[PDB]
Amino acid sequence: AGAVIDGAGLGFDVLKTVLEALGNVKRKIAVGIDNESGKTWTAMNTYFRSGTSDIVLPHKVAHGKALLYNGQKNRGPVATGVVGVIAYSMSDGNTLAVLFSVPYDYNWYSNWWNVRVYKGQKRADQRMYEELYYHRSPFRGDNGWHSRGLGYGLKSRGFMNSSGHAILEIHVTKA
């Protein structure tokens, strides 16, 4: 599962459509990551701190392609939201990691996201979640764009909306 498209085509409308495919689950997320890194990406794993997906990370995401992925709250009366880390291996032997955090209760919490390059093949897990959420200055899902250099000749530019029906759009480009 998990579709790929031309990166040039990635945008808010495309991700809204992804979002809408999932239906009115109370908390969910549509994730688009645009690979303009100059390298081929290959899926490693997704670490869900909470929530799940019915789909699989697109296995291969070439330079020039964006991946569309999604996540949703666990079924039933569960209020831990959809919080996770996506990990792709890049053809230079390093890892691109993406954090998403979509809480249940917006009267307490907010959406957050982050992006980071790790040296080597590093699977998403709890230590990476904690680093990206608590240590590495994540960006608020505040309906605004945020840019930052990643090192390693790359940078990120991304956008996350503010709500429980979440949209996360990230572009990883050469710096």
Residue numbers in the entry: 5 to 179
Paper quotes:
Fragaceatoxin C (FraC)11 is a potent haemolysin of the family of actinoporins, defined as a group of ~20 kDa protein toxins produced by sea anemones. Actinoporins are classified as α-helical PFT (α-PFT) because the transmembrane pore is predicted to form an α-helical barrel. The lytic activity of actinoporins on biological membranes is enhanced by the lipid sphingomyelin (SM) and by lipid-phase coexistence. Here we reveal structures of FraC corresponding to four different stages of its activation route, namely the water-soluble form, the lipid-bound form, an assembly intermediate and the transmembrane pore.
In the monomeric form of FraC, the side chain of Phe16 is inserted in a hydrophobic cavity of the β-core region.
